[PDB]
Design a protein around this ligand. Structure first.
Ligand SMILES: [Cu+2]
Ligand SMILES: [Cu+2]
Ligand code: NA
Ligand code: NA
Lengths: 620, 620
């Protein structure tokens, strides 16, 4: 019944049939993206109309198409041919990854480069990576992938331990040509293995860990209805899933007495970029847009009970399309559970004699994705006290290179001869805000220091200031940790009992933003990552901070072009885009498999409630 | 056996007997502080010599004394008379707090002020607060407390809901004299109650929370020997307890193969300051040095199983002295347990076919203290992967005032007529470092941005720089979140297998430091709080960033006087002092009892190990 329900196997099958009958899904066609569209703005939208957006690739070279179909009515709404030299290429297809290694294996320049290094071509794996846009005019309008080589000494060996430096190839994956093979010189291939399950490396496993048992003898406190609607401790929301963004949260609201109060209309990680900081021509082009180029949802893991998710776990198993339109289920791809979170509130009062302690809890909604060597966990947390938090967990195997004789300013050494280039992992959270409704505004709040003098004779006073962001051209903001900068999203038409606008405060981690030179290709294509906070006016088609077609797009798409409309955002339907990331100088302890590191952000109520919202939590 | 064992009841009784026999503890004497001294530098040394330091107050007004006792040999080692007008007053005695309300109840200026407000003196509670150093010349050399009034409507009423603004009194707690009563005008006493156990305020309690059961069916994975020595998952340490500092961690080391490798010799929170930013003369003197003036260990709570600490809990019950030298046990004052901490490391490799997941754990050592309206939890965490983390949890009831008609730049409104002055909570962690031994240095690491040009033609390169701090005069450092600034503590004489010095990296939260004007009294007394990082050369008597005697002490002691010695810290026995804190603009949701907010820091291995230290963790 809900318009926000997960897509079902049947809906995807019907899309495939509609496309096929319309003549849009022939044998040379491939589905590069398929996803359900959210309902358009309309608080009285009753007539159910499930619409799906499809990107259709053509393996013969014909122009691709963007298609919108209505599953409810069984029709094609629109179909537009795309000029990819102008608007960007479609996301990389899983089947194109195989092509790169196979093509290079018969190229005489590639074989000659391997022969010089005495490498057996049957043992050389090729990481197929996105191309970006640089100086090669012949790549405009063409689907390119670039390949870097790694040696696998045996089928169970970790090839990442054995990078083949000084060698890179470019491949046209539709015409199946190797356009360039660049050999800048021979580097020794690092010899030590990195097999973290080999007992020779792990040593004997510990026998000292005793079990921790976490159970819920009466079951969990949350309910799931209609497949994906969650109710938990006054919270209400819908858990969506999209093959590009992954888990998406809809209709986040809090039951305050008798009123269901909206907070956030849609929350997602709308892009994530991994730029590399090694100036070697072998890797100086390397920038992953994991969401926009690869689609993080299609690489979601099946999460194992007791290993990935511990406790009383409720699973969702989302359905996506494969490249031919058949439904594919990601079994146990989303974990949901509640967790103890320590003390919520505590006071022992001398004068009243009352000793009071209450415990906190959080709702966890998580999924994990694997893109090549990297594995990322996406965690959304809901707390009893109204706090909303996102956390990304980065693990996997670091991307490697040779470590040069004489050192490097841009690579760290992990093992003899083995390097790890410096890089960042930068996320963009897209928060379609709805604080008590859609009339919202953002204020930037700085601490204000005061000088000793009249009205502050002891020099102890300090204060704060708030600046309303009234237009998009003034809504591109930078962090300032030294002045305690935060941003408040408020509803100027909804007041608390003290007659102040209700609000939520965004607390950032204030990590560095994109470090690349502002004139670089990556700074133009990932402009969102150069600033901590953007606020736009809501529009149906402004979905991603990098635009719809990120792969090989020349730059400026997305947030810089949206912001240029300079729309009114003072008491309007607005969207907050928060940039946050990790700057990774790899350490020896990251090798051969990296312990989790984390980054995120949180939102806390700021006069949203008329008093603490957790006074009715029991002691038990 | 161990020199680092907790003080026993017998040891404290023996100190009492030694002081009595020596003539230093007659009926007019009071013990204001008593604690065990750490062993001097020198491995093994004096077989066993347990020494205690004692601050002895005299209630007749004679000069107090600082005394060192050997409980092993039954002797007084040294006893010095203190000139408190020069070097500072002793910590506040618990029995002095009770004096303030009683003295004021019979002062005719106080009574006239209450009568002007139609308040019954029997219902007026007085919060007795430390006095600081301001413009009152008659206070030099006297023990002064200042009092602020709150109305308690009935014995179980929360008095914090009813501040009596416009009124403050100063009390000499030795001569039992009210020195000044200041009345700047009548303010309405806020009328709403703040009784968070009253059903009329809580409403019906939730019935929706189902239990979460955390058990360890084989018991915990850590062992406790000698009363306070902990071994857990390669970690080794001793848990100390001091009445001033609270929980103190000694001899933190990690078992790496056959070698026990030191990391931290001693870790503590050596001071904490809570400055208020309201320039009203009623409160502009208000600054709590909870550690130095009040002694946070003295007010540690007994922690309730299942409420304060959840799971399979091991308790310690530290013993302290009362004001007469009798031992007082703080039953269940320290909780210790291990906690699941999600995913440790995870990778699903396409080429090898190996799927690998491991879970993380942490060891938790915690205590909670209550100082008037505020309650603070102190949490030390040890992780499987070598990370050490500290977290402070702030809760309790916010300190209140009237909310002025017309508003305020320095006070938040929480309820009709009820205000909460702006303030900070700032901690100083004292880390006596011992990275692989005592020869350590500190480097400051900043990210380095690089310009597009020769050697970086695509403008993607970025790097980092490290600056060694060679002498104390250059070791006073500020945060820079924008450049990703961190500090590395390393051992230049101990190298990992890549021939790089082993190290640990300190990651700060980069919250604002002390906001008061640098000319203010609090900026001089809490100079440590104006900078994020200090590094000193280790010295036996340099224990606290504020000096030994903080109460009513002007500037002149502590970290600014230590660093003036400008000693060599480049490969030497060094101490890191890290300032970190919360800036609190109270919100409506903080009332009537505040949900926990947190701040802290962590240290991560940086080439300390030759590879990941958790390759031997089993799959479970
Ligand atoms: Cu990384
Ligand atoms: Cu506070
Ligand atoms: Na909105
Ligand atoms: Na040291």
């Amino acid at each position: 019944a809900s318009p926000f329900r997960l897509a079902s196997a049947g809906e995807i099958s019907e899309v495939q049939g509609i496309l096929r009958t319309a003549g849009l899904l022939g044998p040379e066609k491939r589905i590069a993206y398929l996803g359900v569209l959210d309902p358009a703005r309309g608080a009285g939208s009753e007539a159910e109309d499930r619409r799906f957006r499809v990107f259709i690739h053509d393996v013969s070279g014909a122009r691709p198409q963007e298609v919108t179909v209505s599953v409810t009515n069984g029709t094609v709404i629109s179909a537009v041919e795309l000029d990819t030299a102008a608007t960007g290429e479609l996301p990389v297809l899983e089947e194109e990854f195989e092509v790169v290694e196979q093509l290079l294996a018969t190229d005489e320049r590639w074989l000659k480069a391997l022969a010089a290094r005495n490498l057996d071509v049957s043992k050389v794996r090729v990481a197929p990576l996105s191309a970006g846009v640089f100086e090669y005019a012949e790549e405009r309008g063409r689907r390119i992938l670039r390949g870097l080589a790694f040696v696998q000494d045996f089928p169970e060996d970790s090839a990442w331990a054995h990078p083949v430096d000084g060698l890179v190839a470019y491949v046209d994956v539709v015409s199946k040509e190797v356009t360039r093979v660049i050999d800048t010189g021979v580097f020794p291939v690092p010899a030590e293995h990195g097999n973290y399950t080999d007992p020779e490396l792990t040593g004997p496993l510990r026998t000292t860990q005793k079990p921790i048992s976490i159970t819920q003898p009466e079951g969990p406190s949350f309910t799931v209805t209609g497949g994906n609607h969650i109710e938990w401790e006054k919270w209400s929301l819908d858990v969506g899933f999209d093959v590009r963004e992954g888990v998406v949260l809809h209709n986040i609201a809090f039951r305050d007495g008798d009123r269901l109060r909206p907070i956030i209309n849609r929350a997602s990680i709308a892009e994530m970029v991994v730029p590399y900081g090694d100036p070697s021509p072998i890797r100086s082009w390397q920038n992953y847009f994991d969401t926009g180029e690869y689609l993080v949802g299609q690489y979601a893991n099946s999460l194992e009970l007791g290993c990935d998710c511990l406790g009383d776990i409720t699973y969702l198993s989302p359905v996506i399309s494969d490249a031919f339109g058949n439904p594919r289920e990601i079994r146990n791809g989303i974990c949901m559970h509640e967790e103890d979170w320590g003390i919520l509130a505590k006071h022992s009062d001398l004068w009243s004699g009352i000793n009071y302690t209450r415990r906190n809890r959080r709702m966890v909604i998580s999924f994990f994705t694997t893109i090549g060597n990297y594995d990322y966990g996406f965690y959304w947390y809901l707390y009893l006290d109204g706090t909303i938090e996102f956390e990304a967990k980065a693990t996997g195997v670091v991307f490697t290179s040779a470590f040069p004789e004489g050192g490097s300013d841009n690579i760290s050494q992990l093992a003899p001869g083995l390097g790890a280039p410096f890089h960042q992992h930068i996320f963009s959270a897209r928060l379609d805000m709805a604080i008590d409704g859609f009339t919202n505004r953002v204020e930037e709040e700085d601490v204000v220091r005061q000088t000793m003098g009249p009205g502050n004779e002891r020099g102890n006073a300090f204060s704060r200031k708030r600046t309303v962001l009234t237009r998009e051209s003034e809504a591109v903001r930078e962090a300032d940790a030294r002045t305690g900068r935060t941003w408040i999203i408020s509803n100027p038409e909804s007041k608390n009992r003290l007659n102040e606008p209700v609000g939520y405060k965004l607390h950032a981690h204030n990590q560095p933003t994109l470090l690349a030179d502002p004139g670089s290709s990556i700074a133009r294509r990932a402009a969102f990552a150069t600033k901590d906070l953007w606020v736009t006016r809501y529009a149906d088609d402004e979905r991603y901070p990098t635009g719809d077609f990120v792969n090989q797009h020349s730059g400026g798409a997305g947030l810089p072009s949206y912001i240029a409309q300079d729309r009114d955002i003072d008491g309007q339907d607005i969207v907050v885009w928060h940039t946050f990331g990790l700057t990774h100088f790899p350490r020896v302890e990251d090798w051969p498999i990296m312990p989790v590191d984390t980054v995120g952000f949180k939102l806390r109520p700021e006069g949203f409630f008329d008093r603490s919202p957790v006074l009715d939590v029991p002691a038990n």
